[PDB]
Design an enzyme around this catalytic site. Structure first.
Site, short mmCIF file in Angstrom:
data_model
loop_
_atom_site.label_atom_id
_atom_site.label_comp_id
_atom_site.label_asym_id
_atom_site.label_seq_id
_atom_site.Cartn_x
_atom_site.Cartn_y
_atom_site.Cartn_z
N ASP A 100 -6.25 1.09 9.00
CA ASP A 100 -6.26 -0.49 9.00
C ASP A 100 -5.00 -1.23 9.37
O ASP A 100 -4.11 -1.21 8.61
CB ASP A 100 -6.98 -1.02 7.91
CG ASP A 100 -7.05 -2.50 7.81
OD1 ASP A 100 -7.17 -3.26 9.05
OD2 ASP A 100 -7.50 -3.04 6.83
N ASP B 111 -5.34 -5.35 15.23
CA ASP B 111 -5.92 -4.91 14.17
C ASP B 111 -7.08 -3.97 14.32
O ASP B 111 -8.04 -4.16 14.68
CB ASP B 111 -6.72 -6.29 13.38
CG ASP B 111 -7.34 -5.97 12.05
OD1 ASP B 111 -6.97 -4.79 11.48
OD2 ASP B 111 -7.77 -6.96 11.51
C1 LIG Z 1 -10.15 -7.89 9.27
N1 LIG Z 1 -9.63 -7.30 7.83
C2 LIG Z 1 -8.78 -5.85 7.94
N2 LIG Z 1 -8.38 -5.54 9.12
N3 LIG Z 1 -8.81 -5.54 6.63
C3 LIG Z 1 -9.59 -6.16 5.79
C4 LIG Z 1 -8.73 -6.74 4.66
C5 LIG Z 1 -7.79 -7.72 5.28
C6 LIG Z 1 -6.45 -8.27 4.45
C7 LIG Z 1 -5.37 -8.67 5.21
C8 LIG Z 1 -4.12 -9.34 4.29
C9 LIG Z 1 -4.61 -10.22 3.11
C10 LIG Z 1 -5.66 -9.44 2.36
C11 LIG Z 1 -6.94 -9.16 3.33
C12 LIG Z 1 -10.74 -5.66 4.98
C13 LIG Z 1 -11.71 -4.87 5.85
C14 LIG Z 1 -11.25 -3.33 5.81
C15 LIG Z 1 -12.33 -2.61 6.86
C16 LIG Z 1 -13.65 -2.62 6.36
C17 LIG Z 1 -14.25 -4.25 6.24
N4 LIG Z 1 -15.36 -4.30 5.88
C18 LIG Z 1 -16.25 -5.38 6.47
O1 LIG Z 1 -15.69 -6.08 7.41
C19 LIG Z 1 -17.67 -5.58 6.16
C20 LIG Z 1 -18.39 -6.47 6.38
C21 LIG Z 1 -19.75 -6.54 5.87
N5 LIG Z 1 -20.44 -5.49 5.28
C22 LIG Z 1 -19.60 -4.35 5.03
C23 LIG Z 1 -18.24 -4.19 5.32
C24 LIG Z 1 -13.05 -5.25 5.43
C25 LIG Z 1 -10.15 -7.37 6.68
O2 LIG Z 1 -10.76 -8.48 6.23
#
Ligand SMILES: CN1C(=N)N[C@](CCC2CCCCC2)(C[C@H]2CCC[C@@H](NC(=O)c3ccncc3)C2)C1=O
EC number: 3.4.23.46
Length: 388
Positions: free
Chosen positions: A37, A233
């Site tokens: 990530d 990202d």
């Molecule tokens: C964009 N994005 C990202 N790149 N990492 C996160 C965290 C961001 C972080 C940024 C800094 C401040 C704190 C937050 C987390 C993401 C990890 C991968 C799996 C995802 N899961 C889903 O999106 C998901 C959606 C629906 N159902 C299941 C899973 C959730 C996010 O929202």
């Protein structure tokens, strides 16, 4: 020459479920699959039973586990993750031959975090300390890696989209790409690497200076393209664009592809579109070029993606089906996994720059390919950046 054979082909997964690398945590080592990530900065792993996990980090079984006696609560748009902070010894089996002492957030509760059938149990936040949770004193993994070893302060990602749906067994047996830690492997790309500055070290923030749809200038004020930021990202699936940019881009993509009409649900990225096996009309869809600020004053370069990147293959039949992988954002541009699949991306932290080259594994046809080209004369590029 490819000089990082130990790390080549160390990723598995796909754009919609995420790309992951094998890691080990604790003593004796506990093997876990971890999503890569570039959009976050915490190493956070499932540490309690969850319906979507078949394994998790068991702190009580690690002799090297250190409890920091502190909780961490991380809400985000789609959901949240909560856990307990600690440190442990961490290694990457198909990575550098080192073991580091790193912070680990042991996830105890979550909502819309884990993905059913993704085969990963945690995430590796590769961005900077500024966006680490609870705050910037929680040293991110890569910072620990660089401080504790002789690993160069750089990593590179080749995310490989298959170009067609992979079933459960195929996606487990298939190579999804490479994460080269501490270097650049020349076998993963063709042509030259072009670099854009990292505007600020928090997310991997960049500046887009021009957008074209089949060579036609979208002609918006370039600040709109980076409102309120533009980031790279791997933890986001789609190319996400600010509302006004999205509206203008979809209008232009519809106009270029107007020989076929698609339902509103397709353009909203909700509904799939299907064609008879092998008849996907790639040629009716336009290429999209994003011009990025260059390293030289008044110079830019462009990355060009095909519909083979922004149409995401999905299973319906024997039809070839896709979802439109460009969507609206209220938090800036996000160059997600579908864009990254076209390129070998170099996160050159040491030189505060991101490199792009055509991926040796990008999906294309016999008539068009993705491209990374330059230079172009571009003036007042600093004005493209958004402030406040
Ligand atoms: C964009 N994005 C990202 N790149 N990492 C996160 C965290 C961001 C972080 C940024 C800094 C401040 C704190 C937050 C987390 C993401 C990890 C991968 C799996 C995802 N899961 C889903 O999106 C998901 C959606 C629906 N159902 C299941 C899973 C959730 C996010 O929202």
């Amino acid at each position: 020459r490819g000089s990082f054979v130990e790390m080549v082909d160390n990723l598995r997964g796909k754009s919609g479920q995420g790309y992951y690398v094998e890691m080990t945590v604790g003593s004796p080592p506990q093997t876990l699959n971890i999503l890569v990530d570039t959009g976050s900065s915490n190493f956070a792993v499932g540490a309690a039973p969850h319906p979507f996990l078949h394994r998790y980090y068991q702190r009580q079984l690690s002799s090297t586990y250190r409890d920091l006696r502190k909780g961490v609560y991380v809400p985000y748009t789609q959901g949240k993750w909560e856990g307990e902070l600690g440190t442990d010894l961490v290694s990457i089996p198909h990575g550098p031959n080192v073991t580091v002492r790193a912070n680990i957030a042991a996830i105890t509760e979550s909502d819309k975090f884990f993905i059913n059938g993704s085969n990963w149990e945690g995430i590796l936040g590769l961005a900077y300390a500024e966006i680490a949770r609870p705050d910037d004193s929680l040293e991110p993994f890569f910072d620990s890696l660089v401080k504790q070893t002789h690993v160069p302060n750089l990593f590179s990602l080749q995310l490989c989209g298959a170009g067609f749906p992979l079933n459960q067994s195929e996606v487990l047996a298939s190579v999804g790409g490479s994460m080269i830690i501490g270097g650049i492997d020349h076998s993963l790309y063709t042509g030259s690497l072009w670099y854009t500055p990292i505007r600020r070290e928090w997310y991997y923030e960049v500046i887009i200076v021009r957008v074209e749809i089949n060579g036609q200038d979208l002609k918006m004020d370039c600040k709109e393209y980076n409102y309120d930021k533009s980031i790279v990202d791997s933890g986001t699936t789609n190319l996400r664009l600010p509302k006004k940019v999205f509206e203008a881009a979809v209008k232009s993509i519809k106009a270029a592809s107007s020989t076929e009409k698609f339902p509103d649900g397709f353009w909203l990225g909700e509904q799939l579109v299907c064609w008879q096996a092998g008849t996907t009309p790639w040629n009716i869809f336009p290429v999209i070029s994003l011009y990025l600020m260059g390293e030289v004053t008044n110079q830019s370069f462009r990355i060009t993606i095909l519909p083979q990147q922004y149409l995401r293959p999905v299973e319906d039949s024997q039809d070839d089906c896709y979802k439109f992988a460009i969507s609206q954002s209220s938090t800036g541009t996000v160059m997600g996994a579908v864009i990254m699949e076209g390129f070998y991306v170099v996160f050159d932290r040491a030189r505060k720059r991101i490199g792009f080259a055509v991926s040796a594994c990008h999906v294309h046809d016999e008539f068009r390919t993705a491209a990374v080209e330059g230079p172009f004369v571009t003036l007042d590029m600093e004005d493209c950046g958004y402030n406040i």
